[PDB]
Design a protein around this ligand. Structure first.
Ligand SMILES: Cc1cc(S(N)(O)O)ccc1NC(=O)COc1ccc(Cl)cc1C(=O)c1cc(F)cc(C(F)(F)F)c1
Lengths: 532, 400
């Protein structure tokens, strides 16, 4: 049945016109199936037999008895835009625990809603012939596969829902595509009655609800998870066993395994990723290395782990703990009460041009904060592997504005620290290397070296080099040859940045080497001076 | 209602709503329902594809909509140079005035906004305005004839007081003593109820070069580097004599006696920095620019200019009590202060160059925003020198 609900005024994009796409010719075996399916809709009031008046048309097809398929791709290209149909998806970690929940598949509620009469003509399609005139139609309801259908449907439901929603506050409905997720904490008797009440209310608007047959039952499969009443789990992750792995397989595998590293602790794909090196085709067969075979082995076992979590109890604290799994790799878990996580995660190593761990730490904190607010609308209390004195010393001085919401120190190694802190002033009694490097940027030939106050010196000849590389190399050598305390002067502009951001990781192998060196010194003072 | 339209070829805004805290959502929900009743806004269908960010600020919440994009696309439509001279200026929020006035029916769809639902549990509530929205460029404009009218009396009664209207804000400036000033304001609020800035003290502080009993190789080095850069603002600055003492490969800590030429060179440079570079003038056809540097420990430096190195104004902002552990707070605070002076002085907001990460700012700035207007901004990477240089700005003898 159709709904006695107002239509929404639909328009075609600016100036464009209705579609005039030739009807793909079909076999007598398919025309017959369509004719039938269409006569059934016609009687349901969903479609209207129409005349030649209509200059528009959309191709209808036949797939599988048979099922009809109309291609509105063209119409969709010419149909106005709508408010994006809820782009963000609901996360299980953000569900308050209800005592009872019921799923209502307002499925073909699409066909349940009328189409702006003004617009119906653009939906005209044609059922071919065995040469002779075919049978013409046009949708009187939101078409399956049409651009605005999902949006319109959702809104329609919404209006219809406003009343009840307003009448039963102690109840919660979650709108998502074809379904409604209705939960509560009343008594199972009472809940059940409401469901029936809602259900009933819906039919009241030509919108009909499921069948004891289609009714889904817990646990529920939500984006790879299984939704159990008092907790949630993950659908089992299957790692095929084979004696022949193609590129495609390995990527596919790495894909699935990457997603698992979010929930499961210890998943690794380094050795597996290695297999992709220099691959020439997807169908290419890459034999697994010994390490690859082991990795894959240990992972098959980690997925045999019963990873599970709890639901959202707003009356309880929201806590997020973070760990540094490696340089640039961060893991985190958000739980309300110890060991009972709601959600966990890991952020892929970030390959910046230059940065430091404390910075990366705030970045993790900030992605988590934004996540939380979307999931819970609150921001967690943080447990971060960094001391308050450490944080204090870094942030107060850093050139960029930074911040971490309320947090506390949790001593769980490895801890994030400042690998080195350039001296505020020149070091007395420490050698002073005046470094410098130059190079024909074109011939890429250069030299670098230094001349300390103590008379020590050097110059190195380098081929296939840039001016930047020489300058930095100048600094590196200085670092090499110096003692645990050293003053370094340089006209390098990139060094100026180092003085400002004191990065502990970058994209240049060079810088990296310099950092290692910086880290190793007991005292270093870097001074910049203009060139010439 | 008067017919308003978007600039030729401009389509409506479709800015995505950022997530909001439960607290803020509840607030907006309450606020909007009330407005709905009063027919100030109405729910809308999905056929309306536009949207504008919305949020709540501040002990009750006030609804703040981010019309920057719409303002920009809104068809186009004077400044009193005396305000900047007044002894004291008080700012007043007159956005409520608009609600009365109806918004052209054909333009309303473009004011469409969305209230976010926690964990995407429910599609957000869509609304659009029926009446003049606070924060929209057109509102203060449309409601202009009406504003003059209600202002005339007070104005004509006190021709000594200057009043300037910016967006939802009204800046009233006079010269009376603090008490007599505050009194005149109420006389105005009362006048309005029926329907603390100080420009003269905003003094331009100069750059100050260090002075030392004895100078070290380093001291000079750092010094010469800064003067060299600054050379881009004052072509008369010279570092020759200074760079001569820097000949050789001495220890960074060794003390260097200054030649007399170097002493003079330093003197000439000190005299040159005594005043702001000549020939700098504000241009209305050009955008104002405000750059902020984090000096650290609650200190921040800013420069307002339209052409690089040609500062219209420069300054320092010290964090405010109860903002210690929060960089973002201080920054938003400073941004509002600077934007305010900008309006006071030129009647427009500057575009900002913020020393902060896009994600960091966009996640927390609203938590401390308190103005009805929102400036334009961009995020940048502070050049170490620019920072070192303005760090050199002069400060009060003892204070103020
Ligand atoms: C899974 C379950 C079963 C029962 S019951 N009635 O005993 O079988 C009771 C509570 C729960 N779960 C909870 O307490 C927390 O979960 C929930 C709490 C409230 C509501 Cl209304 C739904 C759920 C869901 O489990 C759920 C399931 C889905 F497939 C999809 C969605 C969503 F709407 F987000 F898209 C939500």
């Amino acid at each position: 049945p159709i709904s006695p609900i107002e239509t929404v005024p639909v328009k075609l994009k600016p100036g464009m016109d209705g579609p005039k796409v030739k009807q793909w010719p079909l076999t007598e075996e398919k025309i017959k199936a369509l004719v039938e399916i269409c006569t059934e809709m016609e009687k349901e009031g969903k479609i209207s037999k129409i005349g030649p008046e209509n200059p528009y048309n959309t191709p209808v097809f036949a797939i599988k008895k048979w099922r009809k398929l109309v291609d509105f791709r063209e119409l969709n290209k010419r149909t106005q835009d709508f408010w994006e149909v809820q782009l963000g998806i609901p996360h299980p970690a953000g569900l308050k625990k209800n005592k009872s929940v019921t799923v209502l598949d307002v499925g073909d509620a699409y066909f349940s809603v009328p189409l702006d009469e003004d617009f119906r003509k653009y939906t005209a399609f044609t059922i071919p012939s065995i040469e002779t005139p075919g049978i013409r139609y046009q949708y009187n309801v939101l078409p399956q596969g049409w651009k605005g259908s999902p949006a319109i449907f959702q809104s329609s439901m919404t209006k219809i829902l406003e009343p009840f929603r307003k009448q039963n506050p102690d109840i919660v409905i979650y709108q998502y595509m074809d379904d409604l997720y209705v939960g509560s904490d009343l008594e199972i008797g009472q809940h059940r009655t409401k469901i029936e009440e809602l259900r009933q209310h819906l039919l009241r608007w030509g919108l009909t609800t499921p069948d004891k047959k289609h009714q889904k039952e817990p646990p529920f499969l939500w984006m790879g998870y299984e939704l159990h009443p008092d907790k949630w789990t993950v659908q089992p992750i299957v790692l095929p066993e084979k004696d022949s792995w193609t590129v495609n397989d390995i990527q596919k595998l790495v894909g699935k395994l990457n997603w698992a590293s979010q929930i499961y602790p210890g998943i690794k794909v380094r050795q597996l990723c290695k297999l992709l090196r220099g691959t020439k085709a997807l169908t290419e067969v890459i034999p697994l290395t010994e390490e690859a075979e082991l990795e894959l082995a240990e992972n098959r076992e980690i997925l045999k782990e019963p990873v599970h979590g709890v639901y959202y109890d707003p009356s309880k604290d929201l806590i997020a703990e973070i760990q540094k799994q490696g340089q640039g790799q961060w893991t985190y878990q958000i739980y309300q009460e110890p060991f009972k996580n709601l959600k966990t995660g890991k952020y892929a190593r970030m390959r910046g041009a230059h940065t430091n761990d404390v910075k990366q730490l705030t970045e993790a904190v900030q992605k988590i904060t934004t996540e939380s607010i979307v999931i819970w609308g609150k921001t967690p209390k943080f447990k971060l592997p960094i001391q308050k004195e450490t944080w204090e010393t870094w942030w107060t001085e850093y050139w960029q504005a930074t911040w971490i919401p309320e947090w506390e120190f949790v001593n769980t190694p490895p801890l994030v620290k400042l690998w080195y802190q350039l001296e505020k002033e020149p070091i007395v009694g420490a050698e002073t290397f005046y470094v410098d490097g130059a190079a024909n940027r074109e011939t890429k030939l250069g030299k670098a070296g230094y001349v300390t106050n103590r008379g020590r010196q050097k110059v190195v000849t380098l081929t296939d080099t840039t001016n930047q590389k020489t300058e930095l190399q100048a600094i590196y050598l200085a670092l090499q040859d110096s003692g645990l305390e050293v003053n370094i002067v340089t006209d390098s502009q990139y060094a100026l940045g180092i003085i400002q951001a004191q990065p502990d990781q970058s994209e240049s192998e060079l810088v990296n080497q310099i950092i290692e060196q910086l880290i190793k010194k007991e005292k270093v003072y870097l001074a910049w001076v203009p060139a010439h | 209602t008067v017919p308003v339209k978007l600039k030729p070829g401009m389509d409506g805004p479709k800015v995505k709503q950022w997530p909001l805290t439960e607290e803020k959502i509840k607030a907006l929900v309450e606020i909007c329902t009330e407005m709905e009743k009063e027919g100030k806004i109405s729910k809308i269908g999905p056929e309306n594809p536009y949207n504008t960010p919305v949020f709540a600020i501040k002990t009750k919440w006030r609804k703040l909509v981010d019309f920057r994009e719409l303002n920009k696309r809104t068809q186009d439509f004077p400044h009193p140079a005396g305000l900047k001279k007044n002894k004291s200026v008080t700012v007043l929020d007159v956005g409520d005035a608009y609600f009365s006035v109806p918004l052209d029916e054909d333009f309303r769809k473009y004011t469409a906004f969305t209230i976010p639902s926690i964990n995407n549990e429910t599609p957000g509530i869509r609304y659009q305005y029926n009446v003049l929205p606070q924060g929209w460029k057109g509102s203060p404009a449309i409601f202009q004839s009406s504003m003059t009218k209600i202002l005339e009396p007070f104005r004509k009664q006190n021709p000594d007081i200057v009043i300037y209207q910016y967006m939802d804000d009204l800046y009233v400036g006079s010269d009376l003593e603090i008490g007599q000033h505050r009194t005149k304001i109420e006389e105005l609020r009362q006048h309005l109820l029926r329907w603390e800035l100080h420009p003269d003290k905003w003094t331009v502080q100069p750059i100050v070069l260090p002075e030392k009993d004895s100078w070290t190789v380093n001291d000079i080095q750092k010094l010469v580097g800064k003067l060299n850069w600054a050379s881009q603002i004052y072509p008369g600055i010279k570092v020759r004599q200074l760079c001569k003492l820097l000949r050789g490969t001495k220890a960074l800590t060794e003390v260097i006696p200054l030649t007399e030429e170097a002493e003079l060179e330093l003197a000439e440079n000190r005299e040159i920095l005594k005043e702001p570079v000549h020939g700098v003038y504000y241009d209305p056809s050009k955008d104002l620019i405000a750059e902020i540097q984090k000096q650290g420990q609650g200190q921040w430096t800013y420069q307002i200019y339209q052409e690089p190195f040609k500062n219209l104004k420069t300054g320092k902002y010290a964090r405010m009590r109860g903002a210690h552990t929060n960089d973002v707070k201080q920054l938003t605070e400073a941004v509002q202060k600077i934007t305010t002076e900008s309006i006071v002085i030129w009647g427009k907001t500057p575009k900002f160059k913020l020393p902060i990460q896009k994600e960091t700012w966009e996640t927390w700035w609203t938590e401390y925003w308190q103005a009805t207007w929102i400036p334009e901004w961009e995020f940048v990477n502070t050049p170490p020198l620019v920072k070192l240089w303005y760090q050199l700005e002069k400060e009060p003898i003892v204070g103020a």
